[model samples]
Target: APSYRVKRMDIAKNDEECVVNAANPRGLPGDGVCKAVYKKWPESFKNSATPVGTAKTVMCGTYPVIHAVGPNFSNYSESEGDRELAAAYREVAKEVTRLGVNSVAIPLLSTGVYSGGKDRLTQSLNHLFTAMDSTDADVVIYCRDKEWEKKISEAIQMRT
Candidate 1:
């Protein structure tokens, strides 16, 4: 069965074969978790194979990193913003399934400077998890800080 766990750990340290990058819409790993990944795996982002507005999978040290384009968390209507975030989750899930990767590590979809904050991040997680629950992959939702981990824990509890 597919299962999920929330960990207060750096995503780069995750043991999974795949990690999800909360990426910019242009496919650049410029900030937050994505930036850390780029620094560690420059080869993964160099003339990358993935395209904009889609889920691009990059290989880092024999493992795949699923990079899904996320919105800027501003400049769009509330509903539109939600749609964009949802797209990131869905695309990442799809790629995970396609690659037959049994496990993946995903940071909070958007909780950075460009994120819409905890409420929006939780909602995006719900959308992502709902779709991922149907797949055979086990997911690890990695939180960068205690606050994020707590909020995500509360959110997951509420859904149970």
Candidate 2:
């Protein structure tokens, strides 16, 4: 079965137990649909991972909010490309799957910024979803951009 959903809402405004943050290296949420959610739901926003890569401190929430496993690269060398960042998307999903969330909502990782080709990013995401088992968890792959979201939908559907 497929493991994701496509939506046009802001991740922040989502009242779900938790929303996967497609954050950048600085740990601040970036633009796109996720940012819209973050703007209103900043309180619900939790840093996905630090700039150097580590789980962030959970804020004051009733349930254990998650900062799924992922990489946050501090670009010091100026190498452009998000292969590394792409990996973080899968890694974070794996962590969430491992932790056993009933479902997860994620954005198109770094296709917006941070340097990643759309084809490669979509391909990586396909692989990640295939790896996830256990029907207990349902994954949501959200896209705000009309272009990228369509691409992501095609990619995920084709993979299935």
Candidate 3:
């Protein structure tokens, strides 16, 4: 199941329906756990050719992946790019809800080493959280690191 408020490891260890890689679609690797796994198990990233709605390739895991668009955390196309990234999660949200994934984990996009993903990050969060509040999926916005957590917390708190 999904834990609304918990650590990412807790969610993963508990067999959450899915964990958000919160990654980009361009296959830009970060030093995150998923990328670390891919580094060790290089072949594990491959997926078969499928003309899907989103160029999604399912990792050998419990849940489908949500590959968003981004230029890491340092930069982002807030207007178009942010919407596209949000669309990625929007589509994933629809599918997860459809598949009855009660819980999921997500890291912030466009907010890491690459560019200031504030706009994109906000866009994605708004879309995903609003969707969850209206759906059955118990979504958890998993922060990748402490600083990211702080930024997200501040953002949400400021909004409230």
lDDT top scorer: 1
lDDT, candidate 2, 51-159, per-residue tens:
4322333443543334432332234232323444445554565556555657666655444444332344554465456444434567676655667667767765775
What are the clashing pairs of model 2? Answer: 4-139, 5-140, 5-141, 69-92, 82-115
Whole-model lDDT values for every prediction: 0.74, 0.51, 0.51
Error of 3 at 102 (Å): 1.3
Order of quality (TM-score): 1, 2, 3
Cand. 2 Cα-lDDT: 0.51
lDDT per residue for candidate 3 within 40-140, as digits (tens), equals 33443564222212324355554455444433434434465555555655656665666666766665444555446244455556665654555666666
| Model 1 TM-score, 2 decimals | 0.87
How displaced is residue 4 in candidate 2, in Å?
Answer: 2.2
- Clashes by residue pair, model 3: 2-103, 73-112, 73-114, 73-115, 74-114, 74-115, 74-116, 75-115, 110-117
Work out the TM-score per prediction.
Answer: 0.87, 0.64, 0.63
